[PDB]
Amino acid sequence: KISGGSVVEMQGDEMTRIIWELIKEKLIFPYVELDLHSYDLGIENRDATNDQVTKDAAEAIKKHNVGVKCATITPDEKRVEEFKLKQMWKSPNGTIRNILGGTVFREAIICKNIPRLVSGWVKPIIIGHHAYGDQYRATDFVVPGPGKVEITYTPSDGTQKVTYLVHNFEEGGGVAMGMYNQDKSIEDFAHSSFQMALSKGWPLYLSTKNTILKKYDGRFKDIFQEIYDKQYKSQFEAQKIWYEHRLIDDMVAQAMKSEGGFIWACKNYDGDVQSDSVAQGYGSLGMMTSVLVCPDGKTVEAEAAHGTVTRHYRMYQKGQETSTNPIASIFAWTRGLAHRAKLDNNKELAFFANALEEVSIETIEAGFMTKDLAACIKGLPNVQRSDYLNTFEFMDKLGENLKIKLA
Amino acid sequence: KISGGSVVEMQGDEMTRIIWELIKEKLIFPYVELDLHSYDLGIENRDATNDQVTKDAAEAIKKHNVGVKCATITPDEKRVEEFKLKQMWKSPNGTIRNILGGTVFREAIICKNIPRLVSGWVKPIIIGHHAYGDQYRATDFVVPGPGKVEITYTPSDGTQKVTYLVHNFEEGGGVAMGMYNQDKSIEDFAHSSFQMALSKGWPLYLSTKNTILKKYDGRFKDIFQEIYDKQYKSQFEAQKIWYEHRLIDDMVAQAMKSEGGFIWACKNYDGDVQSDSVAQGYGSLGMMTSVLVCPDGKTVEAEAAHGTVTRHYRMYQKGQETSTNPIASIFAWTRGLAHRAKLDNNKELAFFANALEEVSIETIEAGFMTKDLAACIKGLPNVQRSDYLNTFEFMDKLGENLKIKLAQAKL
Numbered sequence: 046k047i048s049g050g051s052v053v054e055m056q057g058d059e060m061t062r063i064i065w066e067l068i069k070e071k072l073i074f075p076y077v078e079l080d081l082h083s084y085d086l087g088i089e090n091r092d093a094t095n096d097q098v099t100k101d102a103a104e105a106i107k108k109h110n111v112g113v114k115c116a117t118i119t120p121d122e123k124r125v126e127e128f129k130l131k132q133m134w135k136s137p138n139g140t141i142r143n144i145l146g147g148t149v150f151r152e153a154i155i156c157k158n159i160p161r162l163v164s165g166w167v168k169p170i171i172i173g174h175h176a177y178g179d180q181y182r183a184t185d186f187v188v189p190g191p192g193k194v195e196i197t198y199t200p201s202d203g204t205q206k207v208t209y210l211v212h213n214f215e216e217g218g219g220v221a222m223g224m225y226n227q228d229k230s231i232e233d234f235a236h237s238s239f240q241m242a243l244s245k246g247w248p249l250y251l252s253t254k255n256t257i258l259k260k261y262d263g264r265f266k267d268i269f270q271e272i273y274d275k276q277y278k279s280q281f282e283a284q285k286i287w288y289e290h291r292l293i294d295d296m297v298a299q300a301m302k303s304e305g306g307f308i309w310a311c312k313n314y315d316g317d318v319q320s321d322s323v324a325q326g327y328g329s330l331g332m333m334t335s336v337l338v339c340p341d342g343k344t345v346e347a348e349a350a351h352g353t354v355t356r357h358y359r360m361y362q363k364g365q366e367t368s369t370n371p372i373a374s375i376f377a378w379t380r381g382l383a384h385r386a387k388l389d390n391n392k393e394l395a396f397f398a399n400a401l402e403e404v405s406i407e408t409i410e411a412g413f414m415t416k417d418l419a420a421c422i423k424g425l426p427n428v429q430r431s432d433y434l435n436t437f438e439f440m441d442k443l444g445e446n447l448k449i450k451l452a
Numbered sequence: 453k454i455s456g457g458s459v460v461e462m463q464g465d466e467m468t469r470i471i472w473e474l475i476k477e478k479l480i481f482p483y484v485e486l487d488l489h490s491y492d493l494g495i496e497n498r499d500a501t502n503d504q505v506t507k508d509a510a511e512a513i514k515k516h517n518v519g520v521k522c523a524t525i526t527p528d529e530k531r532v533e534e535f536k537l538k539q540m541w542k543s544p545n546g547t548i549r550n551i552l553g554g555t556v557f558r559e560a561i562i563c564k565n566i567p568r569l570v571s572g573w574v575k576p577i578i579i580g581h582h583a584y585g586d587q588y589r590a591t592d593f594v595v596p597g598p599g600k601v602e603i604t605y606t607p608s609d610g611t612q613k614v615t616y617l618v619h620n621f622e623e624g625g626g627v628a629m630g631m632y633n634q635d636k637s638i639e640d641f642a643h644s645s646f647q648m649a650l651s652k653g654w655p656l657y658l659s660t661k662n663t664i665l666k667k668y669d670g671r672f673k674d675i676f677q678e679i680y681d682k683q684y685k686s687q688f689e690a691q692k693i694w695y696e697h698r699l700i701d702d703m704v705a706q707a708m709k710s711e712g713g714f715i716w717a718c719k720n721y722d723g724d725v726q727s728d729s730v731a732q733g734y735g736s737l738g739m740m741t742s743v744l745v746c747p748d749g750k751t752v753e754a755e756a757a758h759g760t761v762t763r764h765y766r767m768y769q770k771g772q773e774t775s776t777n778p779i780a781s782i783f784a785w786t787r788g789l790a791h792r793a794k795l796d797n798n799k800e801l802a803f804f805a806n807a808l809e810e811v812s813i814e815t816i817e818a819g820f821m822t823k824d825l826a827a828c829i830k831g832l833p834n835v836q837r838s839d840y841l842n843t844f845e846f847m848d849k850l851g852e853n854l855k856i857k858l859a860q861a862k863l
């Protein structure tokens with residue numbers, strides 16, 4: 046009945062797919078009508094269309110400014126045999142992120158009754174990681190035997206091509222890889238980082254390994270520092286916050302013993318990994334939001350940070366009972382819809398967005414939660430069946446709670 | 453007085469250099485005589501020898517089979533300016549690890565009175581991280597403007613040349629790099645991992661991102677699997693343990709919520725970073741061992757995993773009282789000497805090494821400790837001067853306790 050606007054939706058795989066459908070059936074569709082542009086990133090369909098469906102979904106997001114994505118399978122060899130795939134398709138996440146660009150901001154979803162693994166974290170940690178380039182765009186290969194691996198730069202302006210020696214393999218083979226990043230993208234990431242910091246009133250840290258990657262990482266470090274000095278510094282001081290670069294070793298240690306309450310700017314690989322470390326440290330991988338904010342200020346893709354949860358899905362196929370946390374998948378929808386509402390100045394969509402979220406927190410805070418969350422309070426071995434609901438029960442319960450509150 | 457043998461010693465920088473001298477002077481030299489082959493990896497001395505001293509140290513370690521290393525500054529632009537360096541020298545750790553090769557095993561040092569940051573870790577987590585290649589021997593450069601970055605392989609015979617497009621820079625510039633690893637080194641790293649799992653009777657996890665780096669990381673995953681199946685699987689099933697690959701994201705989450713009690717094989721970068729996170733989670737960076745175990749099975753370099761503690765050094769330079777935890781540095785010596793002893797079948801030195809370890813734990817467990825550890829107990833905002841000992845005080849107390857312990861043993 047509520048008029049949503051246009052949303053790009055990406056369907057995914059395995060356990061998350063199951064959950065994705067439950068969320069549309071019970072939390073979204075009964076209450077909200079949309080111009081839904083649906084792309085199926087299920088791995089069967091991606092194989093069928095030779096991954097073209099993925100490039101299509103990314104373009105759709107540019108047009109419509111808003112995307113909600115279910116977790117997908119990125120195939121290695123086992124996966125190729127499993128689904129009889131054409132080939133080892135690349136990560137859709139990496140494909141879409143590289144086309145859209147921007148910064149991925151992740152943040153735990155906090156309930157008051159859910160204890161943390163790490164004692165100190167009483168304030169949020171917001172991770173914003175660079176979406177573009179590096180490992181997702183890397184070229185890696187097997188080195189078959191002895192020989193020489195080199196990397197070369199040929200300037201477009203006709204001046205001398207430059208060649209560096211990567212390694213001389215003199216005994217057997219191995220592996221080698223090239224990767225890159227772009228100044229403009231890195232600039233965008235710096236501004237997005239400083240702006241999020243000002244926005245929250247929290248200090249900003251950048252982590253790199255510039256002592257080791259002196260040129261590659263030093264470039265991130267320099268770009269951040271240049272832009273800070275020229276463009277944000279006084280505004281930081283005015284708010285009594287700060288920016289500082291830290292080596293990645295020190296940062297992860299610092300973060301661990303911290304009391305939280307900062308923005309953590311990461312390179313792509315570190316953002317990907319440290320975001321799992323942090324979600325789990327607050328409680329669970331089901332309790333983290335993830336939004337890609339594009340450089341335009343306008344476009345957004347929301348998702349759950351975690352994967353398809355194949356381990357739980359395997360039980361589901363064997364007919365056994367499961368308890369998977371859908372909270373993150375649900376916030377992919379509320380964050381996306383929130384943004385849609387703010388774009389269109391849709392007063393009611395915004396209301397629904399925020400309702401489903403407080404409904405989610407309120408349900409867990411009343412004592413209805415999936416197995417992972419009960420494990421947080423009790424310790425896994427002390428958890429009994431009466432302590433949690435299963436995937437379907439819990440979805441139903443949120444469903445009836447949404448009913449009551451919207452009514 | 454104990455006859456030590458030949459040890460290759462590598463001297464360092466900043467706060468650890470100070471602590472290094474205190475350890476030698478108060479814990480080692482009073483009791484042990486050594487054929488010390490001393491290499492000064494202080495940054496001034498590396499700059500004066502164009503870093504040749506670091507390669508010499510490494511070569512000395514092949515020859516003598518044991519090395520003990522102090523934390524070193526790895527310079528970036530700020531350090532060049534600070535020390536007026538000729539160049540931004542490469543990490544001595546990378547240099548040494550790539551010359552020797554092998555697997556770096558890192559583990560927390562645990563005291564019964566010290567709370568953890570992470571609740572569940574009632575057993576230890578042992579990380580074995582590949583010492584060779586990757587980021588540490590990378591070639592990286594700034595791309596100054598539009599143009600094409602390519603990476604090429606040419607076989608030794610010259611019979612063929614393979615060119616891969618890395619990126620087409622048309623817009624402006626950026627950065628690019630290449631990195632590499634070798635199969636032999638990866639096979640040695642698999643072996644040490646499975647052996648360490650068997651040794652401890654714990655399960656082994658390997659982490660990669662093979663879904664994203666399909667050839668590079670998939671090479672690691674495959675070598676480990678093939679080697680598991682053919683050579684260690686019977687044995688693993690016998691002690692009722694197991695081996696699995698996990699994706700690095702899943703693995704860090706799994707470690708976080710776990711009970712501990714596993715071996716975690718890591719790629720170079722991940723090992724380097726997660727070992728800090730792990731040490732901190734058990735309570736302190738001062739409380740972790742690190743030994744490079746070479747594939748020859750005979751050669752070892754022991755070190756402190758943390759850095760030079762530059763921030764504590766600044767205070768020291770101002771005359772301000774400091775409290776830096778020396779435990780990891782002391783254990784560089786104790787692990788090195790324990791291995792020298794094992795090599796030489798030397799029971800006096802073996803006994804000494806282990807005696808210095810117990811003394812370290814006993815002193816802390818009796819409530820004498822540096823500030824980081826007192827913060828573990830009280831919470832940083834709650835700790836007062838009376839709660840901890842300063843750097844020299846704590847060293848002097850261990851010195852006393854070591855004297856007692858060795859005396860009681862002589863009796």
Ligand SMILES: NC(=O)C1=CN([C@@H]2O[C@H](COP(=O)(O)OP(=O)(O)OC[C@H]3O[C@@H](n4cnc5c(N)ncnc54)[C@H](OP(=O)(O)O)[C@@H]3O)[C@@H](O)[C@H]2O)C=CC1
Binds near residue numbers: 117350353371417701
């Ligand atoms: N599209 C995407 O954004 C992502 C996709 N992937 C893909 O997903 C697939 C599986 O990835 P994988 O590394 O196995 O791990 P997943 O992140 O899917 O899950 C791994 C483990 O994390 C815990 N976990 C994750 N989500 C939940 C949840 N919602 N509720 C409770 N526990 C959860 C579970 O622990 P436990 O088993 O102990 O209960 C689970 O087994 C792979 O194909 C991978 O490529 C991976 C990451 C992100």
Ligand SMILES: NC(=O)C1=CN([C@@H]2O[C@H](COP(=O)(O)OP(=O)(O)OC[C@H]3O[C@@H](n4cnc5c(N)ncnc54)[C@H](OP(=O)(O)O)[C@@H]3O)[C@@H](O)[C@H]2O)C=CC1
Binds near residue numbers: 256
């Ligand atoms: N040689 C080596 O193996 C390594 C060398 N390095 C080099 O060390 C230098 C400094 O690196 P950086 O990352 O800043 O810092 P370090 O790793 O030396 O330490 C940074 C912070 O960690 C805490 N810490 C580390 N060790 C101790 C200790 N033993 N006792 C108490 N606290 C400790 C301190 O926290 P707090 O300030 O909060 O009290 C300290 O400020 C750099 O030049 C780097 O290149 C870095 C890593 C390894």
Ligand SMILES: O=C(O)CCC(=O)C(=O)O
Binds near residue numbers: 138139701
């Ligand atoms: O795309 C993938 O295969 C993994 C993505 C991921 O883990 C993430 O985006 O955090």
Ligand SMILES: O=C(O)CCC(=O)C(=O)O
Binds near residue numbers: 256294525757758
């Ligand atoms: O060599 C460096 O600069 C840092 C090394 C390091 O952090 C480590 O060995 O854990």
Ligand SMILES: [Ca+2]
Binds near residue numbers: 317318320321701
């Ligand atoms: Ca991840």
Ligand SMILES: [Ca+2]
Binds near residue numbers: 294724725727728757
């Ligand atoms: Ca480290």
Ligand code: NA
Binds near residue numbers: 356357
């Ligand atoms: Na499971």
Ligand code: NA
Binds near residue numbers: 763764
């Ligand atoms: Na300090």
